[PDB]
Motif scaffolding. Structure first.
Motif, PDB file in Angstrom:
ATOM      1  N   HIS A   1       0.865  -1.176   0.000  1.00 63.05           N
ATOM      2  CA  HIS A   1       0.000   0.000   0.000  1.00 63.05           C
ATOM      3  C   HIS A   1       0.901   1.225   0.000  1.00 63.05           C
TER       4      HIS A   1
ATOM      5  N   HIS B   1      -2.110   3.013  11.340  1.00 61.84           N
ATOM      6  CA  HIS B   1      -1.839   3.624  10.043  1.00 61.84           C
ATOM      7  C   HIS B   1      -2.440   5.021  10.062  1.00 61.84           C
TER       8      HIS B   1
ATOM      9  N   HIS C   1     -11.144   1.088   2.914  1.00 60.79           N
ATOM     10  CA  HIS C   1     -10.229   2.176   3.244  1.00 60.79           C
ATOM     11  C   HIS C   1     -10.133   3.073   2.023  1.00 60.79           C
TER      12      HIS C   1
HETATM   13 ZN   LIG Z   1      -3.613   4.357   3.554  1.00 57.07          ZN
END
Ligand SMILES: [Zn+2]
Lengths: 397, 49, 397, 397
Positions: free
Chosen positions: A153, C153, D153
């Protein structure tokens, strides 16, 4: 290496499954693994540490087996097992820190510490347990020469770079042409400018181009493309090429005309996109080639026509830019990204124990210096150390 | 406990005490049945013997 | 609390493993757990709800055991088990919503609802199953005083703040000096300005500084540092300090000179970085100290030299800024971030059932007001409610 | 479909658990599943491929069972099982690529390939194993009409759109009013402008509004709201509505006054927030309604008062903007996002084998064209293909 993951897998499961009050049939197969760890490990002795400020410790294993006769586990059975797990989990920390700190240049994929060389005998192979994590599965597929893949990611594939290029210049710096860019992390922002706004160009169109080569081949990427460079949009003063003088850049921004993004692989065009913004895909590539051009608007209101004269004093400079951003991709070598903290665990061990600069890695584990010259000798070391850092993260966060 | 007969096969991989500790719901009976199941020796070399 | 996770773990596995046509040896150990749930739970009776608009429901358990005699499971065996799972999974929803809605100030780590206090007896401890999730593992390590850690995150560690500071001012507001900043989420954008462009400063250098203290100690962070504040780059009008008048800010932007970023812990410098942009690490810190300075360029082309005169009318104001961004870090207390939705599940229950403002949490569960005064009494409540919200997310999305 | 996931689950576990040196009791229940795969699959024969450049292959299964008599597994037992797994894992790749490439318009939720129609008999139902993944759990809950949910996300819920609206205009384009916006990915940046700076408005206040409808209903979102549109902050030239002429836009930026964000569901206000920036939640919504207004500052220093005269030449145009961004949300239909690569696996198969444009999906699998007209006939096809792409990702990355 395969038996170092197998020690950490059944110490993680031993703290999770051996709880008070649980039924015995829930843990009937873990105890047969945990007893068979102990039988293999007794009588041996180990030694970790010695480099930098990492202290020297000696390890010695003389433990007894666990009972296999209860129906529900009680607090005697838990508390007699916690004082065995807490000695093994201290042993695995000091083997993983002993291996993340060492490196070699001939064959970096081999174990380097004294303890991990000793665990690679056929005596210790019966401790082997399932290999279900991502890094230990790619350790085994790549060891037999089969195709692997890591999913990231926002991968740190671009080294940091911020510079420019002048295709037309003079010492007065008042009639310029060229591009500016920022390549950092997983994002490209390029912007082309022209002070004359194509008043003397053929058909009043100025062509720009910017080519970014990669270090490793990415696969099945998801890329966001937006038609503005927001970083090169404000007035600023920029030094010259050799740091002699400074020059001024006052932009106004048109839209990018005739945008073409190409995704190359060994010089072959895999994908192409023409005036298509938003989210795009890229199935297999190792070179991104951006192309865009400035066109002078043929019709202008009186508020616009004052900005772009025919003569020399140009006080408002034309600017055309793009913005590219990789959201997620699949590579085959290890990298760094924005989700997992495997790079941060490696550097924090080396910084804490004051480790000298070795022959392979850059001083201070600088990622910009490491992805710039990403040799195959550094790739074998970087996979060997990220895999050990992944084993240590199961036990000790 | 009012259960039926065992209906036990010759050549069962599990002994009749082993398919009884999973059926009986009494705690005091079944953890004695579990002790008899998993009861064995311990091989320890005492004086070289 | 430990037995509330153990109810939800073997109802999640019962809907996944008890399928039609599967072999019996695949589910031979789950059924021994699921039958031993039922034996413990029969004869008891419960009561949930009562606060706000959350309705009152009564629960009563009288069920029969599952069969242990098939070789392959058929559609009779599945359909007679689904009408038992669907009553338990409705019970766990109403216990988890009863606990996320209540709070205490003396000892918030204790259970507050009537049903969860009753499940904490030693009669119900035999339902205990493995504890392998992240929040239930950190619930148990922290309950014995061992070191824990949560991986985030982009963690919401900074409260929202947007303000400025004038180190030199007058009521005309035409010769100013100071800094501006935005702290929001996990991103810091500071920018220092000087209208005179250091024409009378000693050695034509103006020094800036910006110090950000944290609320909790972060560990092994991955931080991106870029040498431009893109938010403080355009012309704007800003009110005064007391809201009396407004003042104008027209920037031009130089590059930041002599950048030093420091990472403090109890006043001790853990890490430091000097003119090093891109990705950096920070192993242990609780205070970020940014330092950067403006330097007047000694050589200027005629297009630049008109911008910065010696006299008073300054129409183009100099500006130097930075940009910092935390990608991922490891904290020890619970926080909010950009990946998981545990904060959104807590507020959505309280907003739906019209719950009055209690003694601990801010009105409306405002995260800016909660991380500003993040007391140890609020930390024990926030961990107790995020852990219950994590249990409910296994069964009901 | 349920038995295609069950083939891939016990081939993933067979490469992980059947390793050299492991104890037999660790794999005593997997081998009973793996032997019972083989008994069902022998004697059958299959055929995959045929569309596009995807080649035609014939499959035939005649294998022998695995041994169940060792105490620790040796290298004979591993190497005789790897040459059986490697034939099945090649079969599942060519069934998953045969299904991601086909589509129907009447009932897209049914299997389309020849091999997956043949696997849906009751002869093959005994291969069924646990269904614990996210997409195969939502495949089964939605097949019985129960409530499902996918966690994303940064979901790609907005199609790409960049345009404007002029509420007051003339052919000279020197006194304008209206809004500009960019909707792309999961981010909204709207900015309202007024050239006169409300010199003739009633009470010197100009009202703006921007309403964004969604395509699907989102649930429990975490939203970041910041009071500046950084994209509409620099001077630019913009074409007219019909592409005839161009017009100039030179902004200065005030702060947004009286901000109200509303979250609608069937015209009913679920949530509202008034002058509250930072992180906010939104429990249930399908329409976002932004509202903000420009107010002329009543007190101005002499540097500000020159910018806004009473007469017609306005050289500095007022601008007020906002910025919204969805971090994570829970939807019920499938979408694309920034974390997982299921959209990239579908398009990469269709692009590689040169597949013609069918009756349902847009040409080239354009996500902007697919979320714009997101019909219920396209939703059933898109879930059927993302679920097959999730099964293939377990075996082949
Ligand atoms: Zn992210």
């Amino acid at each position: 290496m395969d038996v170092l993951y197998s020690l950490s897998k059944t110490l993680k499961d031993a703290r999770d499954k051996i709880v008070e009050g649980t039924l015995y049939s829930n843990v009937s197969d873990l105890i047969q693994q945990f007893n068979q760890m102990i039988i293999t490990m007794n009588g041996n002795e180990f030694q970790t540490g010695g480099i930098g400020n990492l202290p020297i410790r000696n390890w010695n294993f003389n433990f007894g087996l666990l009972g296999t006769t209860l129906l529900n586990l009680d607090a005697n059975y838990v508390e007699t097992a916690r004082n065995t797990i807490d000695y093994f989990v201290d042993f695995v920390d000091n083997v993983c820190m002993d291996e993340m700190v060492r490196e070699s240049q001939r064959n970096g994929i081999a174990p380097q510490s004294d303890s991990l060389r000793k665990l690679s005998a056929i005596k210790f192979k019966r401790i082997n347990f399932d290999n279900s994590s991502e890094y230990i599965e790619n350790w085994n597929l790549q060891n037999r020469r089969q195709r692997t893949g890591f999913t990231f990611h926002k991968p740190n594939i671009f080294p940091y770079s911020a510079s420019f290029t002048l295709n037309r210049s003079q010492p007065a710096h008042d009639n310029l042409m060229g591009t500016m860019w920022l390549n950092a992390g997983s994002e490209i922002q390029v912007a082309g400018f022209d002070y004359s706004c194509a008043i003397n160009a053929p058909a009043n169109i100025q062509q720009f181009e910017h080519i970014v080569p990669l270090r490793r081949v990415l696969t099945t990427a998801t890329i966001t493309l937006l038609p503005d460079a927001e970083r090169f949009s404000f007035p600023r003063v920029i030094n010259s090429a050799d740091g002699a003088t400074t020059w001024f850049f006052n932009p106004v921004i048109l839209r990018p005309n005739n945008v073409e993004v190409e995704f190359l692989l060994n010089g072959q065009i895999i994908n192409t996109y023409q005036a298509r913004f938003g989210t795009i895909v890229a199935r297999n590539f190792d070179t991104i080639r951006l192309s865009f051009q400035l066109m002078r608007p043929p019709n202008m209101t009186p508020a616009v026509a004052v900005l772009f004269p025919n003569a020399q004093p140009f006080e408002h400079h034309a600017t055309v830019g793009l913005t590219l951003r990789i959201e997620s991709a699949v590579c085959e070598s290890v990298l760094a990204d924005a989700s997992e903290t495997l790079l941060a665990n490696v550097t924090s061990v080396r910084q804490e124990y004051a480790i000298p600069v070795g022959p392979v890695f850059p001083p201070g584990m600088n990622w910009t210096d490491l992805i710039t010259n990403y040799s195959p000798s550094r790739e074998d070391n970087l996979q060997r150390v990220f895999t050990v850092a992944s084993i240590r993260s199961m036990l000790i966060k | 406990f009012g259960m039926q007969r065992m209906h036990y096969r010759n050549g069962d991989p599990q002994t009749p005490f082993q398919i009884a500790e999973q059926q009986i719901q009494n705690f005091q009976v079944a953890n004695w049945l579990h002790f008899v199941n998993y009861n064995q020796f311990r091989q320890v070399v005492i004086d070289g013997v």
